[PDB]
Amino acid sequence: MQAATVVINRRALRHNLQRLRELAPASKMVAVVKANAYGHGLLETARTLPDADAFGVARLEEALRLRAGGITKPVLLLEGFFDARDLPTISAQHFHTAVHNEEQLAALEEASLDEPVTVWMKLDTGMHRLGVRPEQAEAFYHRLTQCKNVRQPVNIVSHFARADEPKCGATEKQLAIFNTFCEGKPGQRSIAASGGILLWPQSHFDWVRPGIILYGVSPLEDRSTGADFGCQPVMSLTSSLIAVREHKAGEPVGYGGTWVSERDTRLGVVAMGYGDGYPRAAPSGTPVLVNGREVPIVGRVAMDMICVDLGPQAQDKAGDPVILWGEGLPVERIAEMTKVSAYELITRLTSRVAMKYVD
Amino acid sequence: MQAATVVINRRALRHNLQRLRELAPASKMVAVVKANAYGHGLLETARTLPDADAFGVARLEEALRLRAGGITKPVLLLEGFFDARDLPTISAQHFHTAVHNEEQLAALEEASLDEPVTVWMKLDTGMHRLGVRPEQAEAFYHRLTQCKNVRQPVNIVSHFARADEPKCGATEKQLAIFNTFCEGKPGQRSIAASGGILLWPQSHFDWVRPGIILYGVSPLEDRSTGADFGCQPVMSLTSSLIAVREHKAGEPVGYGGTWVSERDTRLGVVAMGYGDGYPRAAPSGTPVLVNGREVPIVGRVAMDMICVDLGPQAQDKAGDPVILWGEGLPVERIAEMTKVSAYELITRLTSRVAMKYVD
Ligand SMILES: *Cc1c(COP(=O)(O)O)cnc(C)c1O
Ligand SMILES: *Cc1c(COP(=O)(O)O)cnc(C)c1O
């Protein structure tokens, strides 16, 4: 292929897992690979990290897809199970699960399983998304230690809502609540994801759950990159030019006549659009690398194409290599220029994009 | 349980192709199915419309995927071919192609094919994206009529840049240029897509290329839906609740503490996020249907989850049906609220979303 392609550096992936073990030296690793491993490929990303202590996924379907591909490490269902009839599979597949509601707990109480299941009680410490609230947590917790279907001890998990904002006391407050509930309880503790790992060493505890930074991308919007933490970028969104055309001063480009040229120039057309996952919101001027040289996007990003300004005697030609982000252009730079989160940029890509794996 | 799923109404798809034949009664139909048929499924959308005169795709890869699935109809390569070594496949697969540059034409000229290929010369009439400029078009055109590898006559294609803006004279100008070049030439003429079909009956000519409106979605940003033109919505982005929790006044929700509640209420958590293709940009208040009742999104949309405000004694529960858009809630209403183009909303979805076909 020469069009929409994501190149995944397996070497950078391994480097990052090891680099994260250096940053959180007393904690085991839950490699978070939900949403097709953040756009890098669920199964391939798991196979690249046979050293991971466990893998984290959002849904049951993702975990099963890992077992189907031969992945054997423990897989953590971060949101738990959505149907009580799933417990038998989860037990047999040796999936570890979070438990945040009455339905899940009552399911565990009355299920009949050939083996008990490892559980992580999800505690709501401030995010107010999933989890048992503090005032209901002690009773809920106690019921889990009385389950024959739950492998003792009951582990405790939680998640930060604003760890990337060190100046507000949100994280210290969640930590305060997390610590109060865990006092005197056995079982592993886990509350830190990318942000907690890098900015809060007092939240590492027993297990940390690296997601975005595992792929060498910073979880912060302070324009820092994965390299700020010694992590190497894994993904490169690439394509090729499918046309190099003459253009003249005063002439607009693309839908809505969004951009008008102030000079005679040459425009390049890239085989990349939002039908591939590239943000339609990308404003003119956003950087793209053409033949390893940065050129600006001019005009509205279409479903399948993107126009760039090369210059009046630019000698680039149809077929030449284009980098939307990757090697000489961090996805964080593209997130600042487009105002789109790096999390979304690397993850919200379509099945039209080819996948390459190197090293 | 059910999670992220796109339900495709085959009946509505059929209705729209027929409805468009009623709006452009003297023109053949090029069903545009590029980018996985605008998120509806490339092969299934083609199989639902065996009545289409032809199918349009962005890339050669998409056309070959159609032939692989048993689609037998003529397929139009809207951007042409990117490599001269592809002509033999194009010829053998009976793919019709656009020709916009020197490389493609020179390729046609010196290739040796067992059969000639049907071609549509792409003329740049104002969009300044792809196509031969007016002052180079006559010479370029004449070389195509002299090709033994091109099945005569040479057809002429072009595309509108601002057909959804009837008040600016952009479309009349492109039409003026298109008409001047086609004078005295045989061969089919085609310049109209969804907008040209609905708003410009002078631009129908021989072939019209319905894309977005084929799926029952309006190409305008004037709070018009597909129903404004008698077209029925084909896609329904659905999911289910995975939690219904108590929440209290003054408490924030989600990452960044984006939303704070002014009352004790109950929050629902949807198995839908941008890891599925749902816009991370969706602001609190964006409508979502829970049990066929509209509730607002509260807090930042995460990779796998979305929180909604149900009410203090709302009786919704984990497992209940959620509609992100579809029946009861047009994607155009979500586009207006989120400020994201309906084109991108239905198209930029990930492979995590399951596909259902009804009728
Ligand atoms: C997805 C998620 C993570 C990883 O988050 P990052 O910000 O990419 O580090 C960890 N834990 C939970 C509970 C999550 O849902
Ligand atoms: C995608 C495309 C279409 C369809 O346009 P809509 O506005 O979605 O109908 C038709 N023709 C060409 C050249 C295209 O690239």
Side-chain angles (χ1 to χ4, degrees), chain B residues 1 14 32 75 122 153 185 195 204 226 239 262 286 298 321 331-332:
Chain B
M1 199 194 78
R14 280 183 213 111
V32 180
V75 181
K122 196 167 194 287
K185 296 184 175 60
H204 290 182
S239 195
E262 281 163 295
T286 296
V298 291
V331 69
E332 293 95 334

Side-chain angles (χ1 to χ4, degrees), chain A residues 225-298:
Chain A
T225 63
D228 276 58
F229 311 94
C231 292
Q232 305 173 2
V234 176
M235 180 196 295
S236 281
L237 179 56
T238 73
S239 195
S240 299
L241 291 178
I242 59 174
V244 166
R245 311 174 59 267
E246 298 293 323
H247 193 64
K248 298 195 303 177
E251 294 180 350
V253 180
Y255 294 121
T258 285
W259 181 81
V260 181
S261 194
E262 296 180 295
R263 44 85 107 142
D264 286 348
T265 190
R266 288 181 171 163
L267 300 179
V269 179
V270 194
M272 177 70 57
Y274 58 78
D276 294 290
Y278 197 83
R280 180 176 175 290
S284 290
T286 295
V288 167
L289 298 181
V290 176
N291 283 311
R293 173 253 304 203
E294 182 186 307
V295 295
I297 289 184
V298 292

Side-chain angles (χ1 to χ4, degrees), chain B residues 42-109:
Chain B
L42 180 67
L43 196 62
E44 291 312 315
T45 293
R47 299 204 259 239
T48 300
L49 299 178
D51 187 63
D53 300 288
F55 289 106
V57 291
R59 256 106 94 168
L60 207 207
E61 310 92 275
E62 302 181 310
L64 287 167
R65 302 179 244 170
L66 286 178
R67 289 288 189 254
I71 276 59
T72 264
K73 227 80 133 297
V75 181
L76 178 62
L77 297 182
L78 299 167
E79 300 169 17
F81 52 101
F82 308 149
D83 198 280
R85 304 183 311 250
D86 295 327
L87 282 182
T89 285
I90 299 161
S91 169
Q93 293 284 191
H94 302 88
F95 288 156
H96 298 186
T97 192
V99 181
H100 56 70
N101 64 23
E102 176 66 19
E103 290 94 319
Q104 300 179 328
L105 176 54
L108 254 357
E109 295 185 320

Side-chain angles (χ1 to χ4, degrees), chain A residues 124 131 159 245 276 348, chain B residues 59 124 131 133 245 255 348:
Chain A
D124 175 24
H159 197 46
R245 311 174 59 267
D276 294 290
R348 214 213 309 179
Chain B
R59 256 106 94 168
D124 175 25
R133 297 177 57 87
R245 311 175 60 264
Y255 294 123
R348 214 210 311 177

Side-chain angles (χ1 to χ4, degrees), chain A residues 55-338:
Chain A
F55 289 106
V57 291
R59 266 107 97 169
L60 184 57
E61 315 84 270
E62 302 181 311
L64 287 169
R65 187 175 285 251
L66 286 177
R67 288 290 188 255
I71 300 318
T72 64
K73 296 227 123 176
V75 180
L76 177 62
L77 298 181
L78 298 168
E79 301 170 16
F81 52 101
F82 308 149
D83 199 279
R85 301 183 240 124
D86 295 328
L87 282 183
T89 300
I90 293 177
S91 169
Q93 293 284 194
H94 302 88
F95 289 155
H96 298 185
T97 193
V99 182
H100 55 73
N101 64 23
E102 176 64 21
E103 290 94 320
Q104 300 180 328
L105 175 54
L108 283 162
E109 290 180 326
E110 51 216 30
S112 50
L113 309 173
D114 297 333
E115 299 170 56
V117 302
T118 283
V119 163
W120 288 81
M121 182 178 149
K122 196 167 194 287
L123 175 64
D124 175 24
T125 56
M127 181 127 203
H128 298 309
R129 178 169 61 198
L130 282 182
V132 185
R133 297 176 57 86
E135 55 283 359
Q136 284 68 55
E138 200 63 51
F140 190 104
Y141 175 90
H142 182 80
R143 292 202 278 150
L144 286 169
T145 39
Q146 300 310 301
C147 278
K148 294 298 183 177
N149 294 316
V150 174
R151 218 189 240 87
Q152 305 297 133
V154 177
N155 305 301
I156 310 156
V157 69
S158 198
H159 197 46
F160 289 137
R162 307 176 64 189
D164 57 328
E165 300 175 68
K167 299 188 303 183
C168 67
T171 302
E172 295 88 334
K173 296 178 179 176
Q174 300 194 227
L175 235 18
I177 298 175
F178 189 75
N179 288 309
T180 299
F181 175 72
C182 300
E183 302 175 335
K185 295 184 177 60
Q188 306 294 292
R189 312 181 248 82
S190 182
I191 186 173
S194 287
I197 295 175
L198 303 167
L199 308 186
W200 313 76
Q202 355 82 92
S203 74
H204 290 182
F205 301 117
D206 310 297
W207 294 71
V208 290
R209 311 183 301 276
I212 197 156
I213 196 205
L214 202 226
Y215 307 95
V217 178
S218 178
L220 315 175
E221 290 192 351
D222 59 351
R223 63 179 304 144
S224 64
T225 63
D228 276 58
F229 311 94
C231 292
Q232 305 173 2
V234 176
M235 180 196 295
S236 281
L237 179 56
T238 73
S239 195
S240 299
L241 291 178
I242 59 174
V244 166
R245 311 174 59 267
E246 298 293 323
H247 193 64
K248 298 195 303 177
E251 294 180 350
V253 180
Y255 294 121
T258 285
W259 181 81
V260 181
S261 194
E262 296 180 295
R263 44 85 107 142
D264 286 348
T265 190
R266 288 181 171 163
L267 300 179
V269 179
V270 194
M272 177 70 57
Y274 58 78
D276 294 290
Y278 197 83
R280 180 176 175 290
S284 290
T286 295
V288 167
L289 298 181
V290 176
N291 283 311
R293 173 253 304 203
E294 182 186 307
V295 295
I297 289 184
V298 292
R300 178 70 82 219
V301 170
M303 185 178 298
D304 324 297
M305 301 169 269
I306 294 173
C307 295
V308 298
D309 198 352
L310 305 170
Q313 277 80 42
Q315 266 204 307
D316 310 277
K317 314 205 71 179
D320 291 342
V322 183
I323 292 177
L324 287 306
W325 67 68
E327 188 161 307
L329 181 58
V331 69
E332 294 95 333
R333 177 64 39 125
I334 304 304
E336 182 191 339
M337 299 294 271
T338 60

Side-chain angles (χ1 to χ4, degrees), chain B residues 11-240:
Chain B
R11 189 193 109 268
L13 209 39
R14 280 183 213 111
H15 168 88
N16 298 343
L17 208 208
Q18 182 53 44
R19 176 59 171 168
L20 286 162
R21 305 194 97 113
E22 295 174 354
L23 297 178
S27 307
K28 292 189 180 63
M29 227 67 72
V30 181
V32 180
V33 297
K34 64 192 181 191
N36 197 38
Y38 284 51
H40 302 71
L42 180 67
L43 196 62
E44 291 312 315
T45 293
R47 299 204 259 239
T48 300
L49 299 178
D51 187 63
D53 300 288
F55 289 106
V57 291
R59 256 106 94 168
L60 207 207
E61 310 92 275
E62 302 181 310
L64 287 167
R65 302 179 244 170
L66 286 178
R67 289 288 189 254
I71 276 59
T72 264
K73 227 80 133 297
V75 181
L76 178 62
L77 297 182
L78 299 167
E79 300 169 17
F81 52 101
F82 308 149
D83 198 280
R85 304 183 311 250
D86 295 327
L87 282 182
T89 285
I90 299 161
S91 169
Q93 293 284 191
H94 302 88
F95 288 156
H96 298 186
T97 192
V99 181
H100 56 70
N101 64 23
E102 176 66 19
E103 290 94 319
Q104 300 179 328
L105 176 54
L108 254 357
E109 295 185 320
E110 51 217 30
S112 50
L113 308 172
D114 297 333
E115 300 169 57
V117 302
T118 283
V119 164
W120 289 80
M121 181 178 148
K122 196 167 194 287
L123 175 63
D124 175 25
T125 53
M127 180 128 204
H128 298 311
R129 186 209 273 144
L130 282 183
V132 185
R133 297 177 57 87
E135 254 156 10
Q136 283 69 55
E138 200 63 53
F140 190 104
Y141 174 91
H142 181 81
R143 292 202 276 151
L144 286 169
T145 39
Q146 299 310 301
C147 278
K148 294 297 183 178
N149 294 315
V150 175
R151 185 180 294 99
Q152 305 297 135
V154 176
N155 305 300
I156 311 158
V157 70
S158 194
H159 197 47
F160 290 137
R162 307 176 65 189
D164 59 329
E165 299 176 70
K167 299 188 303 182
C168 68
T171 303
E172 294 88 335
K173 295 178 180 176
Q174 299 195 228
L175 234 16
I177 298 174
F178 189 74
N179 289 308
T180 300
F181 175 73
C182 301
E183 301 175 335
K185 296 184 175 60
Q188 305 295 290
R189 299 181 273 65
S190 181
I191 187 171
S194 285
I197 294 174
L198 303 166
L199 308 187
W200 313 77
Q202 355 79 269
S203 72
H204 290 182
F205 300 116
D206 308 296
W207 294 71
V208 291
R209 311 183 301 277
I212 199 158
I213 196 202
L214 203 227
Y215 307 96
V217 178
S218 177
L220 300 177
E221 300 180 0
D222 60 0
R223 300 180 60 180
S224 60
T225 61
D228 275 58
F229 310 94
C231 290
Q232 305 173 0
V234 177
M235 181 196 295
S236 284
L237 179 58
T238 73
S239 195
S240 297

